């Protein structure tokens, strides 16, 4: 009736938002686990006599290699613009020969079940928000054990051949140096979490129990039943913060490794083609597009499968260790430290000269009840996962989600605040609210540095009603009022939530504005096109500020409780 | 379908729970449908026609069409909401008022009003398969919602004023004098609810709602019916309620025990007019069970000036004078400046300042003052503001034609942030999937609009922005330290609100400071609405997401302009 | 209630039924106790001639029609009809105007309160099975739970 | 293994003039109307699916 | 409507004359003139009316 | 080529003008 009079399609302001690239970095421990179990159940059907490099370790390293190769091809040929890590790889003829080698290398149909979840995606209404997979946000002390280096499996190939009749033959593999990171010898036992010291000890977690089968030389007579055999002469690179490129390290593109890398790629591509009946490549697959990248696994506090402690060379035979002595070395779930009492606050001698409710220094009254969660095996190895899906509530589509490695691992964040729309501002700024559920990683504790992890618990959700928190006039900071001497009325101290008894050993505040936050996320954002720094990378603690609470949430087990080792 | 699909077998190793049952109420601001209906009547009703009907006026026809919206809300509440609200339980629908309820269930309505009613249809979310949005007035408190739910009896009073000529006052001014209800000991009038008559002299200011409603009692229409008498007087009786006896379905649908003849005759007499002269063929009965996702579309707006005030009015004996916007906003208590410090309380402070650590003491040396200033009443800023258009499913501006007319709105004046509870994988999936009250404010903290409170508009921050809460989102910790601590704590991580004297907000965290009205609500129990059981949704983006479509448009009085 | 608890303790393992947010042994016992009292209300309000004063006080036509229709169409296991078949109305043969039927329209609280097991007790047990208290068990905090202020 | 949610049940307060067993046993207080309907539907679905 | 047309009352005498010249018969010649006085709204300037 | 990248139907401001009534008063000497 009033359609032509109001004429609202000709009387609106529309803006679809600014351009925003959302980076996805998969935790490669989970596809490595699936690939190792794939090779376990299929390798005896293969003929490897015409190959001097093919072993189970080499085949697992090839498939993990082709995952990282897919990531480089998406970041270099599909992301606009390409990341600063991929721009450092020169387009010279040697690099182009290796890129053409893994662009036409044959991949089995199993690995595309994982790789179809890494396809790019652009939202419908947010038509300038893009999700794509790239390692352009990767720092080594933040992401090193969650990104499985394929050079570990060449060393496992070297140990799988050796004619030794020792009991646990995978322990020389755990000694093998992978990289030098500026002053630091990082071994396989640092990245897989199977060898520590306090005398060397072996801890067999779910990742090392799976990978130890590839480097155990008790079955070396099966792998030596061939005319000609060779070993990988892998050269250990020395990098620092200024020269670390994850694509050069993961794709083995150092100048003293490019011939071995090329022979590795072509030998195992021919092996997959002739024996695994692999017919497909990555070249016709990096331009595909699907909404499966927005599915992720939400985890709580889990124990590491790594530690950053420096290991010496294994001279003797290693003993068997346990969970608690590993978590003391890995610095996970430590108790609350003791008050050293090095600083002293200035409390007045007369107590009637101040209003003591307005003075933040006690008379040594109440102590804190904040205690960290000590490392327990049932809590931190058997915790349940959540399956996130923004578009459909089907559990058959999370088969590839539990294998892929897209995850948000949240330990202590309980709330994220959304900026409410202002109808008086410009609509570009209103429709460009993209960094809402994100934390800048200046505040995020690194996992592969020598830091301590104390798990102060999230509040129990066993209340009777739902809770929320609303911020007035400014959400960017929480006000603490400072009063003048003569005020209008009595200030009521009922809205002040006190954190009684702080002594440097408990959290004093619970607000991170724009060391303290324990978070890893697959979903990231870099604020520029330069080298990723700690001031430019954001970890997304959730995607529900973007996709809503109307999205599907399903609860499941861990992958090692779902995929058995046989 | 996967090498490991049979081994892992996710359909037997996942837990699935859609969440618990949760009903989200929708209370439409019926000023905007009234603004549409008045414009429909002023183009369909000439003063040179329709002279043979005794109860049909522009005023009575607008009142009928406003009545049928509230009738639709009652029918959806009483017959489709599971269970009905306490306000609909108090109606004797089975015996005493069955004739009236059947009268407006079979009353004929023009096809214009179903453009508004198609937006009020019930809706259940897809993945949230136990979250039901439906329209209901079972959350309505009078001092929160009275001027925003336009009472149909106002237009019955306008019809009654169009009959005779008073001493020295116009039909519009005598219509603004007309008492609507006696709420407690107060006398609520049309000039309170429409906002066209304030104060020992009386003044008149036609704001955008009163300027449209003025056409139902203007001088030409009043001169038509004095010089051509046909129209009869409704014998309507004025209700007298309080907090324990108020019911919006009694007041809006005229269901008092002494108004039962009047209401039935009104419904039947204007149903006959709409079926004869307005080609109406459709009723409400087949329409209350229909479902659509149109109820989730809304209009977000910032601080706007009220088209009401709650000051007591005396009887207008003289002729009123001309008023303006600033003098009306002083009476409506909108956009008041910063209050003066009365200095009625004095804190302690040491004569020797080097006995305490001043940076950890919340009382100054009378130093830096607060730079928080309220935004005062500006006509261009508070009447001509821009609106947003929320739609969580589509991206079409043609679909928002009906949501500007519907009145489904969120009017946020000072809230800048809402915190989402993140999912805990170690709790129950029912509790994780039942995060429904995120983005709600309990109305114990919300400033009432039709009580006689004062609205000072401290501004939101000018527009990334992010805030992360650790270990507990329910409260923001303020640390109180031991004397001997491990290391010196960092003072630079504190945000100080300096110079708080009781005239500026001391805190920004709400665990009445909140200035909010929302159409989207939730009631905790099946009882009468209290201030401790009603929530106002300041947003819907915790539920639907920032991937929802947001457009930007003008006010309805700038689209349907005069 | 003693029969229903034994039916639930054999039909509900702690190793199963982990995807439901409101289902417990406690809540299931409370549901099955609720449906007995629901049957008594329906017989009183729709079959006793006339209904009792307690059933006259329920706004069955408008306000509580959704709830009454919810438990009239609620699904009940076949175990509970073994008890409900004994509660059916009966008129004597030669005493053709003496009607026996089930009704709570004679219930005084100080006479009949512990013998009519309130379903909200089991709702309180469900609520106590969620969190851990200071120094008391879930059973003892369930015994502390207030049912009503009479 | 947290999945179970909390019923937000409100405790009734009656006397001799206001006691009704069909209100107390069937949870028909004005503030318990959401809780009762969700309880009945949520356990009817469980009995129809798993029992 | 303009302020000049709003001053004409909708009483029965005025409505009788308005109904008289609303149903008065007009020859086909005068519609050749009156067809040029029809209203018009521009296409792109969709809120300019003549 | 750059149609989906620029996406100019989703990156413009459009306004068709305000309401304006243009009155025509014929010189009746000619009819």
């Amino acid at each position: 009736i009033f359609a032509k009079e109001i004429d609202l399609p000709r009387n609106v302001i529309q803006h679809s938002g600014n351009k925003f690239i959302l980076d996805v970095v998969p935790d490669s421990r989970f596809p490595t686990f699936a690939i190792t179990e794939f090779v376990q159940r299929s390798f005896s059907n293969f003929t490897f006599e015409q190959y001097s490099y093919v072993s189970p370790a080499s085949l697992v390293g090839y498939l993990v290699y082709m995952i990282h190769a897919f990531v480089f091809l998406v970041d270099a040929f599909e992301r606009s613009p390409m990341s600063a890590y991929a721009s450092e790889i020169d387009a010279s003829h040697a690099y182009l020969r290796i890129i053409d080698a893994f662009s036409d290398a044959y991949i089995p149909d199993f690995l595309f079940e994982i790789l179809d979840t890494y396809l790019s995606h652009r939202l419908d209404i947010r038509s300038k928000l893009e999700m794509n997979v790239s390692y352009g946000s990767v720092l080594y002390k933040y992401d090193a054990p969650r990104i499985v280096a394929p050079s570990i499996f060449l060393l496992a190939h070297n140990q799988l051949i050796s004619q030794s009749r020792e009991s646990t033959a995978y322990e020389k593999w755990l000694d093998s140096i992978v990289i030098h990171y500026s002053r630091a010898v990082i071994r396989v036992g640092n990245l897989v979490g199977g060898l520590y010291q306090s005398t060397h000890f072996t801890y067999r977690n779910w990742f090392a129990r799976s990978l130890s089968r590839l480097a155990d030389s008790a079955t070396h007579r099966t792998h030596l039943r061939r005319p000609m055999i060779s070993e990988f002469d892998y050269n250990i690179p020395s990098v620092n913060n200024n020269t670390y490129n994850p694509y050069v390290h993961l794709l083995m593109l150092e100048p003293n490794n490019r011939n071995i890398t090329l022979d590795f790629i072509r030998s195992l591509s021919s092996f997959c083609s002739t024996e695994l009946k692999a017919t497909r490549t990555l070249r016709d697959h990096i331009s595909r597009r699907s909404a499966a990248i927005s599915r992720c696994v939400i985890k709580g506090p889990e124990a590491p499968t790594w530690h950053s402690s420096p290991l010496d060379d294994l001279k003797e035979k290693s003993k068997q260790g346990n969970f608690s002595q590993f978590c003391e070395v890995a610095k996970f779930g430590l108790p609350r430290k003791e008050n050293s009492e090095s600083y002293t606050f200035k409390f007045p001698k007369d107590a009637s000269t101040i209003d003591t409710a307005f003075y933040l220094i006690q008379e040594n009254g109440r102590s804190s009840v904040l205690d960290p969660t000590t490392a327990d095996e049932e809590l931190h190895t058997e915790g349940m996962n959540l399956l996130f899906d923004p578009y459909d509530d089907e559990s058959s589509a999370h088969y590839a989600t539990v294998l892929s490695g897209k995850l948000i691992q949240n330990s202590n964040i309980d709330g994220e605040t959304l900026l409410l729309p202002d109808p008086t501002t410009g609509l570009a700024r209103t429709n460009s609210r993209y960094l809402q559920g994100s934390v800048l990683i200046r505040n995020v504790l690194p996992e592969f540095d020598q830091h301590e992890i104390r798990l102060f618990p999230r509040y129990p959700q066993i209340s009777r009603l739902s809770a929320s928190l609303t911020l007035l006039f400014n959400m960017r900071q929480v006000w603490i009022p400072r009063f003048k001497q003569k005020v209008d009325e009595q200030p009521k101290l009922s809205n002040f939530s006190w954190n009684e008894g702080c002594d440097g050993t408990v959290p004093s505040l619970n607000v991170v504005t724009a060391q303290q936050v324990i978070l890893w996320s697959s979903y990231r954002h870099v604020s520029n096109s330069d080298r990723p720094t700690v001031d430019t990378v954001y970890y997304y603690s959730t995607l529900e500020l973007l996709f809503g609470t109307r999205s599907s949430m399903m609860q499941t087990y861990n992958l090692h409780q779902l995929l058995s080792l046989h």
Side-chain angles (χ1 to χ4, degrees), chain A residues 111-299:
Chain A
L111 191 60
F112 288 104
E113 298 174 354
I114 297 167
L115 293 172
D116 282 329
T117 62
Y118 304 131
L119 297 178
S120 297
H121 184 257
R122 184 179 291 169
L123 299 182
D124 288 331
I125 297 169
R126 293 293 175 271
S127 296
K128 293 182 176 66
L129 176 52
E130 294 178 355
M131 291 186 286
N132 54 9
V133 179
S134 68
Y135 296 130
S137 63
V138 169
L139 291 173
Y140 192 77
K141 67 179 182 180
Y142 283 93
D143 293 330
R146 291 176 184 267
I147 299 170
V148 177
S151 65
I152 298 170
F153 298 104
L154 304 182
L155 300 170
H157 173 78
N158 292 324
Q159 297 297 321
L160 185 63
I161 294 171
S162 67
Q163 296 175 358
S164 179
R165 293 179 292 173
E166 292 179 353
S167 66
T168 61
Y170 58 87
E171 68 185 4
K172 290 181 181 179
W173 171 62
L174 299 173
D175 302 331
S176 296
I177 304 169
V178 178
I179 200 168
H180 293 283
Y181 205 100
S182 308
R183 270 89 182 170
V185 176
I186 290 167
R187 298 177 184 269
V188 177
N190 285 319
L191 291 172
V192 185
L195 184 69
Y196 63 95
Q197 68 182 0
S198 66
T199 303
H200 290 275
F201 295 97
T202 297
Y203 179 66
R204 298 290 299 275
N205 54 15
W206 61 271
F207 190 60
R209 285 178 66 247
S210 180
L211 297 182
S212 296
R213 299 175 294 175
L214 300 174
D216 195 1
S217 72
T219 61
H220 63 274
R221 293 180 179 91
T222 306
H223 309 299
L224 292 172
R225 191 177 292 173
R226 71 184 76 189
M228 295 177 284
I229 197 164
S230 61
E231 292 178 353
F232 290 101
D233 291 331
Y234 181 75
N235 291 312
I236 300 166
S238 297
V239 297
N240 56 5
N241 285 317
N242 295 318
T243 59
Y244 176 72
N245 190 355
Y247 293 111
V248 177
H249 174 64
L250 291 171
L251 297 174
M252 304 172 193
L253 297 175
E254 294 88 4
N256 53 3
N257 284 319
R258 284 200 288 264
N259 290 318
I260 300 168
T261 307
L262 183 62
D263 292 331
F264 172 72
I265 292 166
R266 291 190 184 274
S267 176
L268 279 162
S269 67
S270 63
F271 176 72
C272 291
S273 179
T274 58
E275 294 292 326
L276 276 161
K277 264 62 186 299
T279 59
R280 290 183 290 171
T281 62
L282 290 177
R283 179 173 286 173
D284 291 331
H285 195 275
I286 61 170
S287 66
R288 292 183 183 177
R289 188 168 299 273
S290 178
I293 194 171
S294 63
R295 294 197 282 262
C296 68
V297 173
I298 298 170
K299 291 183 181 292

